[PDB]
DNA sequence: TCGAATCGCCGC
RNA sequence: GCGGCGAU
DNA sequence: AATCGAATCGCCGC
RNA sequence: GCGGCGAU
DNA sequence: TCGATT
């Protein structure tokens, strides 16, 4: 409960070390060096404070046991107590966990009787709950709402209701409780400051390894290796080029040779940003007046809404704390001529900025940041500057000439917002408001100062659906590629609309020729009550959906979740929560007499429509999932029981050269309590669930890294705004980046059959029995990749 | 249906007529006369457009029968329909054979209700498919809906608790949805006799309406019947049209009503001095002339024509003459923040119960829209008159004599309106002006329960905050966080001016001084109550006296005593439940903590006549129910027992604190009851003394007559809206609140004339007990308002005068029932002159 | 058996 | 009249 | 048969 | 682990 | 729901 201050020695050395200073000072100046090292020391300093505040709230709460510093002693203390309870003789392990947590919590916030009463009272409460959970299928319906509850008091209150319903349907001493705790303590005594020092020492250590990362005031330290990049000073937490769950998976990158990967990261780190002072000036004012600046600009349904408004209030507090941090960071570096961001990678190869305040943030955070080195905008830069503004306004589904026309027709509004941003709220109403306001300021400058006016604003181009774009390129899918604007097109293609149009074709077919409605008797298991129930035929079901009107908004989420592995089942939950339930609360949905029947009907229709719109996407993710299932399985001779092939990790190499290992590992045994917080084999399921998204994310990351090196080497582009598939640069450089991103993607998939390369990596790993099971590669389609270079709306 | 425009000829007269023009031109010149008469013309123009939009919506919704142009004709036709209904029923019964198919359906609905349901639904159908079938269907489904759910209304005792929740819902579908839910609930309880309604089939409902349509053509004849393509089986149709004369009657009445409903605006010249009952304020001879007294009958207005009240007339004209201007600095701030927030000062960032929660969000959504529409009007009017060097507000009086401004934008409004308005004619502020300028700023911030020396201390300590708010009101939100933000911000600007320009600075800001509890103050003055007078700051006190904190103190004293002594809990059978004792109940309340918050509303409602019963509903809704929703109120295990217990304690605390108030309102209530009764000898039955109204005259010379009148008959439908003798209960309910309000009106009127004649004061901000003037004249207004109050209650015994008015009217049986005048107390009125915190 | 301040604006 | 807003 | 299940990264909270 | 928020 | 483990 007494924490040493890491600051005085461990944080002092970071600034103190001469070798970082002398190296930093020569290139960037002594004062810029000192500030960078002072800043890095401050980041570690802030992190120590953050842990101290969290620990303090945990002492008052008694949730010290939940804190990571009190975890390691409990793990060595617990097994000896469980055996002692058996030797002295609810599950034995759970009682041992309950006693340790209650003892540590009671001491944190001292009578022996009071702790014994608490342990017994919690023990009785848990067993009354545990029996319902340990029945279990009914508890599974309860468990999701139990997981949604917050705090033991709400858990017990929710537990209380489910027990009463469970009694109604029929699934079914104070001194002794104090005596139960006393004997638990008596066994615990058989199983102190020295233990308290262990949590106290660990608390210091965890305070030293969790800094609040901050932007660099000098160009970041280039990555020459696996660790030590980004920030210049030797720290307690050295940056890793790849964020790894294990130190082993970090080390497999130590040997590997990835010259192009390193260049891409170093180039991105080199990009110099500055705070957009004009946008910051606006944001500082509207923030003092509104919780969210753009949230509200003047211009049985009850029970569902009640759950949302509690969430909506909790959401509103969660948004503000993020805002107040970003704003302070924006104010703090507002005067600096330039700031930089260090970059590392996730284990799949996507590029992330390391500091908490980064160009990859929300719209306000994005609008608060701009590049520091501009070039005169010229004719083409103005053209792309206007296109970006239309995109920020939400005009992104029309051809480019209509996007320019929208800007010119709204020129006076744009000018008004630039002149008096607090007097005209039109910018706040646009889809990406603060980024739009930033565009307004530059648009005014070009009008005030002409095409020679210097512009450093980041103009971001985003691929429409990167995963489907990449999957269609791999397998040459024309129909899917056209739906994602990979092919050159007269008009912007909406994949959500195409799916919706195909759904309407099925809807019309089933309404004319459909299964008739059928009636089946149903008997409730508990009641034993026989009620006649109607299964809706496809004809009746289509009629309800046709009455509602099926738009792109019905099919939108199902297409987005496709890359994440969602399929027909997950769609039915989406349709219910997205369109069917919200219509009911609005009073619409009179046609949706049975919601779940409509959602199941719709989810089948969306899945059929998606599978014919993008065949390569669906085919590829099935092929990858089959591969992961085979490798992840352990092969055992049935008679022998010995394993012929152990569970195998899945590994591949991106065209950039980045390798990735996907090792999802599940623990052997875990303990979870209903009323108290719950306390190395490869998981085959997570291997299958993740192989399709992780592989395609690995491909988009290589595309990004290839684009930034190609843009810097073929063209002069030195400033990059990168969000995983969004590519930004200054307007003078904007047209070349648009070219470079098309040239990179065309180059790789003309050069590399990524799926065949994947097959060569695991083909030997398959057991003799497994080879017949593995599906063949999906057939290539009719698409020509050269047409991607001509496409306007691919944006990538 | 279609209404000719009033505007072209009749609104044209307002600017044309020479005598209104010349009278205005002689006082203020031709050109100000041009602007005023065109402005008054626009006020009539805006008002007519208001009627036309409402009529268009009501026509679209079929709610034309709800509109006032259609009420007179419906009142004429309704008896004819009803008589024909009753005769049809008697004629159908007399004839032998199978009864007509509508006969049974028409019977369960009252003959009055069918009559109105047909007229409204036919008028709705015709003004918004003229076929008899669709209108007969539309009638029939409405009859059934009144039949099915009416059964719930008349049963009746349960309906009284569902009546309010039905009213709180807007729109027929929501009303119908709620009634299906209660019907299912009461059927489960078996209240409705267990008879679930069997829905009428469609062919029945058609036949129900046709019999109704036929019955109006015989009796009333507004609708007439026409047959298209007779004898052709395919196209044989019958149609319905409205009688043109009846359509012309609503159209004539619609136009007549649109020309008499103006949207009153401020004056660009000083308002017309009042010389008589009518035609004051605005200068044009208008279709709706202003009245000096706003009355419900022309007769109550006519009583004022004869009366000589020179001081009443002087006070209104002085108040009208006060020159105002729009505070541009405040208006600049309000124009900005309003565009960003629905209520600009609402959410500043700073560092069964579920069913009740749902009702709260519904009300909150209503309150947001209704609040914002008022805001948008005030800002638009403010921006309109922003560039004028001065503007003026006409004034008139309610039937009790309280003074109100006439234009919709007026200084007697909310904070934002009050903040947007400042006086036009200012004087150099001076030392004394600065002092009250800071006191006013302290009160706008909410530092009002404290002596003046610390009010000055608060302002001077927050000097840098006040300065920052004035320099950048948009950059520092501290002013918006105050209790009266825009009025505080208005002080911030003048405070910044005094520091920039010194004590020579010309300040025209209205410094409002408000009596703490004007009703109890007046009642304490009449009967000379020392204890009551001290509690409401009538007598000089060491500190400001909070009557809520006083009552809370006396409540807490009982609670502590009832925690040591007092009844134990007992079990009582109820048609066995525990009845909590005062000892248990005291413990619950002490656990909650009883503050001035628990007692505030009860003291406020005292002047309105509320007593121990009304406090229990207040206590439950104000503190107990919110506590339960918040997760407090575990102590309130039985909420109604706690509320009734606390209501008793508040009533005992209040009655011993302000005795003069309780005694005086009782005496007036007893007077109105005796006067409002009819006196009839029981054996003969003849009425010896008729029901009599209540009349008195203020010391200012204002007469006032209380004649609450009850209508003989009324009608009420569940889903469609419903459409003279003295009301004795309203006479007793109203006499005491109205009498004390007539006194504060006289005090206000006597104050403005005394401040105008003894001192030089020419600018008055007046809200019924709030007295405002420029800072240079603040000290004298403080003097003047005290001097008037001491003078009247030394010169006049208002209760004794009141008794002299009605003593002759009392009957001989009633004289023993009448209480004596309440005894005067030991208070000395001259202490009011030295009372700092009376403010009045 | 019943009941338990005035004035305006907006909506129905 | 009912629903909501505001003034005292 | 029984039965389970139905993307990555970051911040805040427990 | 759970919950909430944001990025793609 | 149809695949997946079990």
Residue numbers in the entry:
A (entry chain F): 1 to 89, 109 to 128, 132 to 156, 159 to 196, 205 to 223, 247 to 354, 375 to 754, 767 to 883
B (entry chain B): 1 to 128, 131 to 156, 159 to 355, 375 to 598, 607 to 754, 767 to 883
From the publication, what sentences describe this entry?
A 7-(2-thienyl)-imidazo[4,5-b]pyridine (Ds) and pyrrole 2-carbaldehyde (Pa) pair, developed by Hirao group, is a representative hydrophobic UBP that relies on shape complementarity and hydrophobic interactions, but lacks hydrogen bonding between the base pairs. To understand the structural basis of UBP transcription, we solved six T7 RNAP–UBP complex structures with or without its cognate substrates (dDs, dPa apo structures, dDs–PaTP, dPa–DsTP, dDs–ATP, dPa–ATP complex structures).
We crystallized T7 RNAP containing a site-specific dDs or dPa at the +1 position of the template strand DNA. T7 RNAP is captured at the post-translocation state, where the elongation complex is waiting for incoming substrate and gating Y639 is stacking with the −1 template-strand base. Both dDs and dPa are accommodated at a binding pocket over the O-helix, essentially the same as the natural bases. First, in the post-translocation state (apo), the dDs or dPa template base can be easily loaded at the pocket above O-helix with similar conformation to that of natural bases.
